[PDB]
């Protein structure tokens, strides 16, 4: 029952700026084994681990994933499982696939063949997330085709693990209506990344065009809350109509946003996700959107309370 699997997934946190960088540590985070103690003790049910497999596999057939990297991913997954955390792994920042899905289709499918083969006998609390935030030339209609091809590859190997399927147009709500999950697939969860209002959550983000114009933006008015509720109602209606569970696999506000607004937004979205029985994972543990200080070994207490 994928709804039961969604319940098991529960509340989680992304350990980002880590394995989805070109190399682990490049973006500031190395996944320390003790992080899993910290996260489990704080009350989280799962971790989401973004992984840039594409830079750690050969470019030519059979597109073999490199040994040392595979071993590292094993180590991370098992570290989390040791603490009784559920684990979401994905394919993250496969930029060539977004820019030319035709050229990279078979390589992408080869990655999933290898990942499914590697983890098919791992515990049922490991989840396979097909592809992070499809966008660009990987259009909604092309994604519907590609995700089905990936489902077929994974299911040819593994009919035990729940699969997590995102939306196109950068993984938010805008392309949810366009998403199609094949009827034959019966053990999947649909994932959405929720960052609205984008101008608030990404204000001052150095990698986002024109974001400096958003610096100082607050969040918390009654109207702000009603707008967010309307969007959550839209997602919930889609879930009910399509009979698929919902995982909000990323949500969070950047550190440049005022702390009081960050707390209000984070706490509110979590309460509203909970009312809808969704699973959820905060972006992210300890970096630019972070809630834990790895030097001081302390949580931001208000943000941790918001997440529970």
- Other CB atoms within a 10 A radius of the CB of residue 105 amount to 17
Q: How was this structure determined?
A: X-ray
What is the rounded end-to-end Cα distance, in angstroms, of the chain?
25
Whole-angstrom CA distances from 132 to 7, 12, 48, 120, 138 are: 21, 16, 11, 20, 12
CA distance 236 to 272: 11
Resolution (A): 1.3
- All residues at 6 or more sequence positions from 44 whose CB lies less than 8 Å from its CB, including other chains: 10, 11, 12, 13, 85, 307
Q: Are 92 and 22 in contact (CB under 8 A)?
A: no
CA distance 305 to 308: 5
Looking at the structure of the chain, the number of domains it has is 1
Q: Is 237 exposed, middle or buried (0-12, 13-18, 19+ CB in 10 A)?
A: exposed
- Taking every pair of Cα atoms in the chain, the longest distance, rounded to a whole number of angstroms, is 55
By residue range, what is the domain housing residue 156?
1-308
Q: Are 189 and 127 in contact (CB under 8 A)?
A: yes
- All residues at 6 or more sequence positions from 153 whose CB lies less than 8 Å from its CB, including other chains: 109, 112, 113, 116
Tokens of 70: 């595979």
Q: Nearest to residue 180, comparing CAs of 126, 140, 137, 227?
A: 140
The CATH number of the domain holding residue 257 is 3.20.20.80
């Amino acid at each position: 029952d994928p709804f039961e699997r969604n319940k098991i997934l529960g509340r989680g946190i992304n350990i980002g700026n880590a394995l989805e960088a070109p190399n682990e540590g490049d973006w500031g985070v190395v996944i320390k084994d003790e992080f899993f103690d910290i996260i489990k003790e704080a009350g989280f049910s799962h971790v989401r681990i973004p992984i840039r497999w594409s830079t750690h596999a050969y470019a030519f057939p059979p597109y073999k994933i490199m040994d040392r990297f595979f071993k590292r991913v094993d180590e991370v997954i098992n570290g989390a499982l040791k603490r009784g955390l559920a684990v979401v792994i994905n394919i993250h920042h496969y930029e060539e696939l977004m820019n030319d899905p035709e050229e990279h289709k078979e390589r992408f499918l080869a990655l999933w063949k290898q990942i499914a083969d590697r983890y098919k006998d791992y515990p049922e609390t490991l989840f396979f997330e097909i592809l992070n935030a499809p966008h660009g030339n990987l259009t909604p209609e092309k994604w519907n085709e590609l995700l089905e091809e990936a489902l077929k590859v994974i299911r040819s190997i593994d009919k035990k693990h729940t699969i997590i399927i995102g939306t196109a147009e950068w993984g938010g709500i805008s392309a949810l209506e366009k998403l199609s999950v094949p009827k034959w697939e019966k053990n999947s969860i649909v994932t959405i990344h929720y960052y609205n209002p984008f101008e608030f959550t990404h204000q001052g983000a150095e990698w986002v065009e024109g974001s400096e114009k958003w610096l100082g933006r607050k969040w918390g008015s009654p109207d702000d809350q009603k707008h967010l509720i309307e969007e959550f109602n839209f997602i919930e209606e889609w879930s009910k109509k399509n009979k698929r569970p919902i995982y909000i696999g990323e949500f969070g506000a950047y550190r440049k946003a005022d702390l009081e607004s960050r707390i209000k937004w984070t706490s509110f979205v979590v309460r509203e996700m909970e009312k809808r029985r969704w699973s959820l994972a905060y972006w992210e543990f300890c970096s630019g959107f972070g809630v834990y200080d790895t030097l001081r070994k302390t949580w931001n207490k208000d943000l941790l309370e918001a997440l529970i």
